[PDB]
């Protein structure tokens, strides 16, 4: 797999708020064939949704309920893409 | 859709031991298009690995380092499959 050819980016790979959807995109168009694995690890369980869009992009959203530091990993054919894993601080509301 | 058509089973959905790979299988062949999501929650960080086999089955293994009770979630298209979440006792080695 051409994990090195995959790119991801967006606010959900930078900062998030507890209980609020954190969103980012993945572009695998130049990578060829492969499977994606998206992992979120930290103080509570993530709900993850994925949208295979018609426009050459893959939309990801996750929500976690507890504040704290989360690690977001994006792997293509089981290799970390560039910049993965991402450390994301999730703040407590207010 | 599809989650009600998925099945999972194996030793890792029943009981495990700290530091030993806990293994189970998922069969989503009858469920059609979709994303599988697996989660493990309890008193220590899980390392989760996944093998998409060419044989109609998906293999999963997790390892956790601390004994205690863990929950294992298997969802297909954002919905729990039958019997998920699973509660798994993890014993000392």
């Amino acid at each position: 797999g051409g994990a090195h050819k995959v790119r991801a980016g967006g606010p959900g790979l930078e900062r998030a708020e507890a209980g609020v959807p954190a969103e980012f995109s993945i572009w695998t168009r130049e990578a060829g064939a492969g499977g994606l694995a998206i992992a979120v690890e930290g103080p509570s369980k993530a709900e993850i949704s994925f949208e295979d869009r018609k426009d050459g992009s893959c939309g990801v959203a996750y929500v976690v309920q507890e504040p704290g530091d989360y690690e977001v990993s994006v792997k293509f054919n089981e290799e970390h893409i560039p910049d993965s894993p991402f450390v994301v601080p999730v703040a407590s509301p207010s | 859709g599809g989650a009600h058509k998925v099945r999972a089973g194996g030793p890792g959905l029943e009981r495990a031991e700290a530091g030993v790979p806990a293994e189970f299988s998922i069969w989503t062949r009858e469920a059609g298009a979709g994303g599988l999501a697996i989660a493990v929650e309890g008193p220590s960080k899980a390392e989760i690995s996944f093998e998409d086999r060419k044989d109609g089955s998906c293999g999963v293994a997790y390892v956790v380092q601390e004994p205690g009770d863990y929950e294992v979630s298997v969802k297909f298209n954002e919905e729990h499959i039958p019997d998920s979440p699973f509660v798994v006792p993890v014993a000392s080695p």
Binding site: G35, L36, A37, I38, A39, V40, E41, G42, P43, S44, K45, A46, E47, I48, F50, D52, V60, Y62 | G34, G35, L36, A37, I38, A39, V40, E41, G42, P43, S44, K45, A46, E47, I48, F50, D52, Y62, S73
Partner: peptide, 9 residues
């Protein structure tokens, strides 16, 4: 409780 949540597709 800590958690690892993985999505595969």
């Amino acid at each position: 409780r800590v958690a690892s949540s993985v999505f595969i597709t």
